[PDB]
Ligand binder design. Structure first.
Ligand SMILES: CC1(C)CC(Nc2cccc(-c3sc(C(=O)O)c(OCC(=O)O)c3Br)c2)CC(C)(C)C1
Length: 297
């Protein structure tokens, strides 16, 4: 049981060992496509690549490669696309993926610039009057509105397939205070944000998989998805004790390498799930509590 395991690991200060054990047992599959010479400039990080068996394929004959993985959690019955921060040359690809995969929401857990360095391209419009057109993929993106909070911003986008003139609304959830290689300031602020995504309907099975990205698409993104999946597994069974977090993380890692970068991100995952469990099991006050504690105003 996660709560007992957490206290046991915390008492013996062995999170480093626990995390390294996950790295040791983690799946290993080929990423031949990602490693092809022609795709070198489509990868932000040389060592972070999507496995061939679960990579997202762009629907185009020229080059279908993007650095993104489909994390399909069979038991939980929820899918996520984890991808890198789009590069200056892959923004059209990014939105082509969102369109073709029918995603309704995009979760960004990083800031464009972090520690002096540029972790992601500016792949959405910042002003209503200046919409973006991705000529290579023939798509138009317009900022419709945005709700700015103290540590996160929710953006309403309109994505147009210029070829068919079909239009779709995309919700952008920008987490703006999650330190790279770090953890959210508190379980409350993380949960408040996750529930924002959840309550938007973006995670519904009626839409395509939600797209989740930080910089490399594995550390912060992995932490976000592990917490959400665990709460879902717990929810479907209404039994917190039946969830093996480490086992869930390893399942996730069969679809994308490196999920969760640090031992503290893993530790935080337990914290978030344990706290979130209160809501799952029918506490109607914690949600408002988290909102208050998050200081979003
Ligand atoms: C064990 C190991 C060799 C470690 C290796 N680490 C490895 C290799 C290349 C890049 C990264 C990065 S850079 C970065 C950032 O925002 O700058 C990251 O995001 C931080 C965050 O989101 O918290 C991560 Br993650 C990590 C990743 C692979 C999968 C190669 C396995």
């Amino acid at each position: 049981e996660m709560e007992k395991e957490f206290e046991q690991i915390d008492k013996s200060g062995s999170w480093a060992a626990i995390y390294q054990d996950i790295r040791h047992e983690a799946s290993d599959f080929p990423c031949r496509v990602a490693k092809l010479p022609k795709n070198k400039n489509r990868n932000r990080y040389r060592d972070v690549s999507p496995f061939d068996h679960s990579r997202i394929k762009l629907h185009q004959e020229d080059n279908d490669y993007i650095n993104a993985s489909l994390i399909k959690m069979e038991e939980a019955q929820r899918s996520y696309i984890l991808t890198q921060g789009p590069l200056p040359n892959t923004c059209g690809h990014f939105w082509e993926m969102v369109w073709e995969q029918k995603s309704r929401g995009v979760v960004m857990l990083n800031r464009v610039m972090e520690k002096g360095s540029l972790k992601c391209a500016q792949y959405w419009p910042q002003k209503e009057e200046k919409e973006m057109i991705f000529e290579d993929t023939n798509l138009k993106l317009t900022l419709i509105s945005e709700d700015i909070k103290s540590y996160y911003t929710v953006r309403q986008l309109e994505l147009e397939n210029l070829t068919t003139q079909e239009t779709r609304e995309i919700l952008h959830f920008h987490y703006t205070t999650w330190p790279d290689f770090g953890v959210p300031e508190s379980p409350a602020s993380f949960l408040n944000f996750l529930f924002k995504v959840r309550e938007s309907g973006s995670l519904s099975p009626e839409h395509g998989p939600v797209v989740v990205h930080c910089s490399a698409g594995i550390g912060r993104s992995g932490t976000f998805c592990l917490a959400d999946t665990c709460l879902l597994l717990m929810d479907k069974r209404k039994d917190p004790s039946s969830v093996d977090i480490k086992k869930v993380l390893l399942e996730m890692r069969k679809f994308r390498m490196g999920l969760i970068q640090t031992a503290d991100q893993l530790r935080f995952s337990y914290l978030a799930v344990i706290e979130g469990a209160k809501f799952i099991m029918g506490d109607s006050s914690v949600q408002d509590q988290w909102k208050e504690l998050s200081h979003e105003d």
